[PDB]
Amino acid sequence: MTEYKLVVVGAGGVGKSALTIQLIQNHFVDEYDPTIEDSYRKQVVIDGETCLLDILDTAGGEEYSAMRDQYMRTGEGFLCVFAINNTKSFEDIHQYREQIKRVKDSDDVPMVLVGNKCDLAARTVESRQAQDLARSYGIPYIETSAKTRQGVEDAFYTLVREIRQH
Ligand SMILES: Nc1nc2c(ncn2[C@@H]2O[C@H](COP(=O)(O)OP(=O)(O)O)[C@@H](O)[C@H]2O)c(=O)[nH]1
Ligand SMILES: [Mg+2]
Ligand SMILES: [Mg+2]
Numbered sequence: 001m002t003e004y005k006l007v008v009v010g011a012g013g014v015g016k017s018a019l020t021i022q023l024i025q026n027h028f029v030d031e032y033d034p035t036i037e038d039s040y041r042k043q044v045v046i047d048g049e050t051c052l053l054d055i056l057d058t059a060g061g062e063e064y065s066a067m068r069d070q071y072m073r074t075g076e077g078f079l080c081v082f083a084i085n086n087t088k089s090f091e092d093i094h095q096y097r098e099q100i101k102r103v104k105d106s107d108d109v110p111m112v113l114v115g116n117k118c119d120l121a122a123r124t125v126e127s128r129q130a131q132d133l134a135r136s137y138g139i140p141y142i143e144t145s146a147k148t149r150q151g152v153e154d155a156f157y158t159l160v161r162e163i164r165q166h
Contacts, residue, residue, distance in 0.1 A: 004076055005071065005076045006054065007072065007075035009080055010093070011086070014117075016058065019146045021146070023153070024042050024055075028147045040055045041055070055156075077111060080097060082130075084125045090130065093133065110166050113137070115130045117146075118144060127143065142154055
């Protein structure tokens with residue numbers, strides 16, 4: 001099997017844990033401990049290839065562990081998540097990307113911009129705003145809901161396909 005090492009980054013409360021849990025367990029969590037930072041594994045077939053996903057769900061900000069740094073340094077691709085009803089989290093994306101570029105010493109890192117909570121009414125961040133940001137980075141933009149599952153497979157599987165182009 002090929003293994004793909006994925007790291008999920010973004011502001012607290014955007015749904016990084018909910019997205020990972022949805023992908024792995026097919027269930028939506030209302031209140032997952034916001035400090036739990038751990039890795040999760042899933043065997044999936046993507047485009048006819050059986051592979052293993054090794055996903056680090058990052059927590060808790062302005063902090064670094066041995067595992068975090070390892071996945072950050074050895075992560076092959078990054079989901080950069082914001083919530084479409086959280087303007088600050090969208091504005092924060094720039095910092096996560098700058099961080100990733102520094103760790104990787106590269107502006108060419110497999111990455112997907114994820115606008116999560118698309119089930120919630122009256123977004124404060126427009127799709128076209130996020131499209132314009134992702135275009136400036138040279139990366140895809142995908143909207144998701146950890147609640148309904150909309151886009152969740154699409155985001156993680158696209159990141160896998162980005163890593164494959166690399
Ligand atoms: N309505 C809705 N709520 C979500 C979604 N994703 C996460 N949440 C909620 O947002 C809050 C933060 O989610 P969490 O996964 O802990 O965010 P994290 O800090 O980035 O890991 C929780 O109350 C989740 O139930 C979503 O797609 N839709
Ligand atoms: Mg979390
Ligand atoms: Mg506005």
